[PDB]
Structure 1
Amino acid sequence: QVVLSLSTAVKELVENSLDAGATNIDLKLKDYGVDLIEVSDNGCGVEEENFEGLTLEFADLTQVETFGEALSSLCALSDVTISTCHASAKVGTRLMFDHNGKIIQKTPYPRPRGTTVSVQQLFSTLPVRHKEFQRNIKKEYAKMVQVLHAYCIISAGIRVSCTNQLGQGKRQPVVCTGGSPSIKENIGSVFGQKQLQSLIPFVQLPPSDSVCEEYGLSCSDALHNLFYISGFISQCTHGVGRSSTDRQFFFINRRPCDPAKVCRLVNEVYHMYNRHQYPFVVLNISVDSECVDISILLQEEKLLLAVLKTSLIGMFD
């Protein structure tokens, strides 16, 4: 599904940095992104033979919503500058592109290995969408921080930072991870040590007979269990939970997504022990890529739901 939003725009630039094998990703914003969206990484960079080509199998979960290929769509909607340097390249380069993806000017640019993609005046070519962007900047910015917090939690060993600047004012911190190898440590960088106190780690269990009978699972149905689930969830004790689903993140094969059925189940089991609060949820479902399809479709999903409810109940008891 094609989408043109602030959340889908930053997501593609981050995906490009992750695919490049980057360990440092810096996101710079101005006017919540209305004026500038800049993503800098120390990844592989782009070779000179692929400079013109910048703008011209198992299911990918991130491709549920594309933007506008992203880089060609971005040039048609704003002004894009790209400075990059490949390891095989002696000197880096700085590129300016027009609205059709043509390289306006290319100059040698001495810079460390990696790529920096700058997106200035997003949606400037569409005055109707640009005004709707400015008017609903609070909602577009809220959706972007949620996707940004999701990549920070799951990207262990990668330093992800973000700042925002309004007018001539000072840069404002948004989110920052320390390059920690564990997901638990990343949660402490995004939300603080206070958030980690009311959390318990997910402990997977085989589906119980009571839960298996609720979903209609035979002993044969559950024998080929290939779901490996891990993460953290809020304690079921009254008071330690949250008031909404504002901090609930889900991942399939380390890709942020939203399985509506899984989400309704995890919240329902929490309501069985804390009807007045919502849990903090960070949960990754590890499964073979072939068993995942996009219409989110998961083979033996009834077996996955039985494991989650059984494990959540055993933890909350």
Structure 2
Amino acid sequence: LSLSTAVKELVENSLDAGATNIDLKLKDYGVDLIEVSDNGCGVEEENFEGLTLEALSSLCALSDVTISTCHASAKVGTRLMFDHNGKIIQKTPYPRPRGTTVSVQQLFSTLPVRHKEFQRNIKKEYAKMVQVLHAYCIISAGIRVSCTNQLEQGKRQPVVCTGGSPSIKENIGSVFGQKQLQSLIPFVQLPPSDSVCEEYGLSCSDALHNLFYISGFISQCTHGVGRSSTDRQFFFINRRPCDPAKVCRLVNEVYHMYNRHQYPFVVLNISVDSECVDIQILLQEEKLLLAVLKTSLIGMFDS
């Protein structure tokens, strides 16, 4: 029942549509409006009702939901207003490009307690949403992801925007500026060392079936170069944003082994077999993953 959850589900809904453009429009930090527009495949007319049988149903139950959409097979798009039961109040033709735009109006208005806790704690929830959106922007190469905000009677201001660049590094540049990029080194994967294998109780036979492909960027261990907090640490598994506790703790700990007083900027993707993942996300041979991680981090930060 958080802002970042609804935003994330709408974003992944746009991604599953194959959208190359994803725009977020917020009014009063999302308390007033949370809108997502994408050029995805749109929704066929056949599955209009079936959309509220998932994010859409709960969003209808908790807010005022409007959806415009246009499928490639459709001659004209459609505009739909929903009541709180997910039942379509209005279905009118609506000319628009291929894709889908979902509008969430006055979130939590049907529960005044949750709405008020939302308004009073707007800064924290807003910041969490910011972190999630940063993760998706960083990991979504080839896609244009943008976000703007409007407060009260003020004019709209842009929050973030990527240019559909093909590389994660350029996305990081677009999100945080190239000044952030100057202090970053790219992750370089290494086989696990014998000493780290000893530490984690692993033989070479265990390390043989290494199927973890780690990538990303991390702050240099040089004094002062790192960050003062963990405000810019992003982890993914199969390009999906997540927060692995042991992996994060090992990352920050190994960084402290060289830069005691600072935390690193982190962007780290773990490519692994999806069968080896389960639900906190469980990873088969996670000790091997931590061994490769520690060995590689040591190899990079070592002069």
Q: Shorter-chain TM-score: what band? A: over 0.9
| Structure 1 residue 83: Cα displacement | 0.2
Instruction: Return the match for 1:280 from 255, 258, 265.
Output: 265
Contact kept in structure 1, 2:44 and 2:70, CA below 8 Å: yes
| Structure 1 residue 220: Cα displacement | 0.6
Distance 1:295 1:266, change over 3 A: closer
Return the TM-score normalized by structure 1: 0.94
Would you say 1:267 and 2:252 are equivalent positions?
yes
How far apart, CA to CA, are the structure 2 residues paired with 1:285 and 1:295? 15
How far apart, CA to CA, are the structure 1 residues paired with 2:204 and 2:149? 54
Structure 1 counterpart SS, 2:62:
coil
Instruction: Return the match for 1:28 from 25, 28, 36.
Output: 25
Instruction: Return the match for 1:160 from 145, 153, 157.
Output: 145
How far apart, CA to CA, are the structure 2 residues paired with 1:301 and 1:138? 35
Would you say 1:149 and 2:134 are equivalent positions?
yes
How far apart, CA to CA, are the structure 2 residues paired with 1:96 and 1:106? 7
Deviations 1:175-223 (A, max 9, x none): 1111100000000000001000000000000000010000000111101
Partner of 2:117: 132
Structure 1: tracts of 5 or more residues without a match: 58-69
Instruction: Return the match for 1:122 from 89, 107, 114.
Output: 107
How far apart, CA to CA, are the structure 1 residues paired with 2:153 and 2:12? 30
Distance 1:295 1:166, change over 3 A: closer
Contact kept in structure 1, 2:31 and 2:106, CA below 8 Å: yes
How far apart, CA to CA, are the structure 2 residues paired with 1:165 and 1:26? 14
Contact kept in structure 1, 2:244 and 2:280, CA below 8 Å: no
Structure 2: tracts of 5 or more residues without a match: none
Distance 1:203 1:295, change over 3 A: closer
Superposed CA RMSD in Å reads 1.1
Instruction: Return the match for 1:42 from 36, 39, 46.
Output: 39
How far apart, CA to CA, are the structure 2 residues paired with 1:56 and 1:162? 28
Distance 1:295 1:165, change over 3 A: closer
Deviations 1:122-169 (A, max 9, x none): 000000000000000001101000000000000001000000000111
Return the TM-score normalized by structure 2: 0.99
Deviations 1:33-62 (A, max 9, x none): 0000000000000001111111019xxxxx
Would you identify which runs of 4 or more consecutive aligned residues in structure 1 move more than 2 Å? none
How far apart, CA to CA, are the structure 2 residues paired with 1:295 and 1:152? 23
How far apart, CA to CA, are the structure 1 residues paired with 2:7 and 2:287? 34
How far apart, CA to CA, are the structure 1 residues paired with 2:92 and 2:14? 22
How far apart, CA to CA, are the structure 1 residues paired with 2:59 and 2:176? 31
How far apart, CA to CA, are the structure 2 residues paired with 1:223 and 1:52? 51
How far apart, CA to CA, are the structure 1 residues paired with 2:277 and 2:53? 29
Deviations 1:294-313 (A, max 9, x none): 16100000000000000000
How far apart, CA to CA, are the structure 1 residues paired with 2:29 and 2:251? 32
How far apart, CA to CA, are the structure 1 residues paired with 2:216 and 2:196? 21
Deviations 1:70-107 (A, max 9, x none): 11000000000000000000000000000000000100
Deviations 1:258-313 (A, max 9, x none): 00000000001000000000000000000000000016100000000000000000
Structure 1 counterpart SS, 2:216:
strand
Structure 2 counterpart SS, 1:76:
helix
Deviations 1:240-261 (A, max 9, x none): 1000110000000000000000
How far apart, CA to CA, are the structure 1 residues paired with 2:214 and 2:186? 11
How far apart, CA to CA, are the structure 1 residues paired with 2:209 and 2:281? 21
Contact kept in structure 1, 2:33 and 2:107, CA below 8 Å: yes
Contact kept in structure 1, 2:190 and 2:295, CA below 8 Å: yes
How far apart, CA to CA, are the structure 1 residues paired with 2:194 and 2:114? 53
| Structure 1 residue 174: Cα displacement | 1.0
Quick one: percent identity of the two aligned structures? 99
How far apart, CA to CA, are the structure 1 residues paired with 2:174 and 2:280? 35
How far apart, CA to CA, are the structure 2 residues paired with 1:224 and 1:49? 47
How far apart, CA to CA, are the structure 1 residues paired with 2:281 and 2:9? 19
